Paper text:
We have identified a novel gene that is associated with changes in virulence, CNAG_02591 (hypervirulence-associated protein 1, HVA1), through gene expression microarray analysis that compared two mouse-passaged strains to the pre-passage H99W strain. The HVA1 gene is predicted to contain 3 exons separated by two introns that encode a 75 amino acid protein. No known protein domains or homologous gene families exist for this gene. Metabolomics analysis suggests that when HVA1 is absent there is a block in the citric acid cycle, while structural analysis of the Hva1 protein suggests a potential interaction with NADPH.
To gain insight into the potential function of HVA1, the structure of the Hva1 protein was solved by X-ray crystallography and refined to highly acceptable accuracy. The three dimensional architecture of each Hva1 monomer was predominantly β-stranded. There were seven β-strands of varying lengths with five forming interdigitating antiparallel hydrogen bonds to create a semi-cylindrical barrel-like twisted β-sheet. In addition, this small protein also contained one unconnected α-helix. Overall, the monomeric structure of Hva1 resembled a 6-fingered human palm with the α-helix forming the thumb. The crystal structure further revealed that the protein crystallized in a P1 space group with two Hva1 monomers that are related by a non-crystallographic two-fold symmetry. The interface is very extensive as the “thumb” helix of the first monomer is inserted firmly into the “fingers” forming the semi-cylindrical barrel of the second monomer. The monomers are connected by extensive polar and apolar interactions. Although the observed 2-fold association between the two Hva1 monomers may be a crystallographic artifact, the potential for these interacting surfaces to attract ligands and binding partners cannot be completely ruled out. The region corresponding to the monomer-monomer interface of Hva1 was occupied by a bound nicotinamide adenine dinucleotide phosphate (NADP) ligand in DHFR-NADP complex.
Numbering used by the authors:
A (entry chain A), B (entry chain B): 4 to 77
Write the structure that this text describes.
């Protein structure tokens, strides 16, 4: 089933997601949603679920869904 | 302090690093060594030190240096 953001909204591939940190943000479009330990291992990430997206500085980020915001579902 | 692999070898940018998982591996050349909180946040990773590399399937991996092997330094 679906993975949800910090506002309970289903996250889809291609959606713009956002997470802030002290000094900046990571914002960009979802490329993949990883939900099993095996898929996480294959994609080189840890602790699913992970939302994989490229941010505004062209950095590939893997982030937990429950602490980001899907801007397209706001 | 330098950044070292699981065999205590200093890792350099460009070195092939390797980590196995059940069903595959992640192997590729180090592109960046992240040691500061500032750079970790900019690159969307946690808990420096991290070594950043693209694996043989074009997955961008961020990994603890001390839990992988620097193949070029064997």
């Amino acid at each position: 089933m679906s993975v949800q953001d910090k506002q309970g909204q289903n996250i889809n591939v291609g959606d713009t997601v956002y997470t802030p940190y002290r000094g900046g943000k990571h914002e960009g479009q979802v490329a993949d949603i990883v939900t099993t330990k095996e898929e996480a291992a294959e994609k080189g990430v840890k602790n699913p679920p992970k939302v994989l997206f490229t941010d505004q500085n062209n950095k590939d980020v893997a982030h937990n869904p429950g602490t980001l915001t899907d801007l397209d579902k706001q």
